[PDB]
C-alpha cells in the first residue's frame, strides 16, 4: 500500500451515508454489521493489526488468543523454526519429523507435546469502545458507503420501494469502487517494490524464507567480484 492507514471511528461512515434521504434509518448497529461484512469480503491484510503472542503447548494442544482472526506463522520459541500445516491424519493418536500445526477454534493442534510457540496473528484495530476501527482512506470510505447503500437498496428493491435502474446504478458504482479499493490496498509501495525486486532477481535462488519468519524475503542478493 502506498498510503498509510490513519484510523478513524465507525460513525465517520454515517457522516456520509445519511446525506442520502433514503439512508436516514441506518444506525451504528447496522453500520457495525455491514462494515464487518465489507472488511471480511474484501480480505485486505493491511486493515488488520499485526500482533505476536506466545503460548504454551500442554500435549499437542494450546490455548489460542481471544482476538485472533488469522495466523501469519507459528514457530518454536527456543529454536525459531517455523511450523507448517499439518497434513497428518493421526497426529496425537499412537499405535500399539518436521513440526507442524493446525488451528480450528480457540485450540491449536501442534505436533509437539510440551513447548512454547510464537504465533504472529492478525486482529482488528478497536476503539476506546469495543467496536471496529476503520481506515479513513476516502476510497475505502466511499466503497464501504456504496456497500451499505447497495445492501439497503437491495432490501428496498425486494420490497418494491426502489426502481430497478436505481439498484443497477448502485451495483455498478459499487463494483467499480470495490475493484478500485482492492487495487489501492494491494498494489505495492516503492519500499515494498524494493523488497519484491530483491526477492525476484536472485542469481542463487533463496527458497527457505519460511523457516525464518520471512525475515530475508526482501534482502538483496550480493555476489562477490572475482
Amino acid at each position: 500500500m502506498v498510503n498509510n492507514i490513519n484510523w478513524v471511528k465507525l460513525p465517520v461512515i454515517l457522516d456520509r451515508l445519511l446525506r442520502h434521504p433514503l439512508l436516514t434509518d441506518l444506525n451504528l448497529e447496522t453500520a457495525i454489521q455491514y462494515t464487518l461484512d465489507f472488511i471480511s469480503a474484501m480480505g485486505l491484510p493491511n486493515v488488520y493489526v499485526d500482533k505476536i503472542e506466545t503460548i504454551d503447548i500442554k500435549e499437542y494442544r494450546g490455548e489460542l488468543p481471544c482476538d485472533l482472526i488469522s495466523i501469519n506463522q507459528v514457530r518454536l520459541h527456543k529454536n525459531g523454526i517455523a511450523l507448517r500445516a499439518m497434513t497428518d491424519n493421526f497426529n496425537a493418536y499412537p499405535t500399539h519429523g518436521e513440526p507442524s500445526f493446525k488451528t480450528q477454534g480457540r485450540v491449536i493442534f501442534t505436533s509437539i507435546k510440551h513447548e512454547k510457540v510464537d504465533i504472529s496473528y492478525k486482529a482488528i484495530m478497536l476503539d476506546d469502545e469495543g467496536l471496529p476501527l476503520i481506515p479513513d482512506n476516502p476510497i475505502f470510505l466511499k466503497t464501504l458507503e456504496l456497500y451499505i447503500k447497495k445492501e439497503w437498496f437491495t432490501i428496498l428493491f425486494d420490497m418494491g420501494k426502489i426502481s430497478p435502474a436505481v439498484l443497477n446504478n448502485t451495483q455498478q458504482e459499487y463494483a467499480f469502487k470495490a475493484g478500485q479499493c482492492n487495487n489501492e490496498f494491494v498494489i505495492p509501495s516503492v519500499s515494498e517494490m524494493e523488497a519484491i525486486t530483491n526477492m525476484w532477481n536472485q542469481l542463487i535462488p533463496r527458497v527457505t524464507e519460511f523457516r525464518r519468519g520471512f525475515k530475508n524475503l526482501g534482502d538483496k542478493e550480493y555476489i562477490r567480484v572475482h
Binding site: L203, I204, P205, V207, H226
Partner: protein, 51 residues
Amino acid sequence: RLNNPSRCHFGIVGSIYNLNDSRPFSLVDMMKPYNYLYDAIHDRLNKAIAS
C-alpha cells in the same frame, strides 16, 4: 658463488607465475567466476527438474 661472498640462499627454490611484479593471476583464478556461474545456473536447473 665464486666471486661474491655475500651470494647465498637456502634449499628453497621456486617461482611465482605472475605478471610485472604483481600477484599471480593463476588459471584457477581466471576460470573460477565461470565455475561459480555454472554452479548457480545448474542449481536453477536442478530446481526446475524438481518442480
